[PDB]
Amino acid sequence: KVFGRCELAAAMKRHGLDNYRGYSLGNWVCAAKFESNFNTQATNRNTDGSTDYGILQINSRWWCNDGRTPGSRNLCNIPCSALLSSDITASVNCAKKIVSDGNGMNAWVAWRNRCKGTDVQAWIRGCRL
């Protein structure tokens, strides 16, 4: 599923991401835009042989099991395929663990490089929240 900007904002809010660990909703929407272009099916292979999955590009080295990443810790206790669902619940629940890991949203390189320090509230402008 390819989400609309406000559609995703609403879905993320419903699943408790607005101000989760102090990160306003716009941060999450901005991260999703540059990680996956709002596409739940996005996958990208990393240089270390791991793969990133879903709307928030969660990595198979640490967070989910894709059956081809030796030494995966599977800390979200889920198959990576579950992160490609049109239902974002699994992605959101796993992202909540990632952002609590100590480095906050810096865990997402696209957030650090493209969202951090910008006017992220723009990403929820015009939406019914």
Ligand SMILES: [Cl-]
């Ligand atoms: Cl933080």
Ligand SMILES: [Yb+3]
């Ligand atoms: Yb990425």
Ligand SMILES: [Yb+3]
């Ligand atoms: Yb990556």
Ligand SMILES: [Yb+3]
């Ligand atoms: Yb409201």
